[PDB]
Ligand binder design. Structure first.
Ligand SMILES: *[C@@H]1O[C@H](CO)[C@@H](O)[C@H](O)[C@H]1NC(C)=O
Length: 31
């Protein structure tokens, strides 16, 4: 159920300016 992790991450990265390419390092949900 990777889509659960993906949806979390997409919602988390909702404040990235237009042309963004960045590595986010945090205490993110794991599998
Ligand atoms: C979280 O993701 C859902 C879609 O699964 C979306 O409808 C909702 O608005 C998102 N929340 C935030 C804060 O982006």
């Amino acid at each position: 159920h990777w889509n659960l992790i993906e949806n979390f991450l997409l919602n988390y990265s909702i404040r990235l300016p237009p042309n963004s390419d960045v590595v986010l390092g945090d205490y993110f949900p794991t599998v």
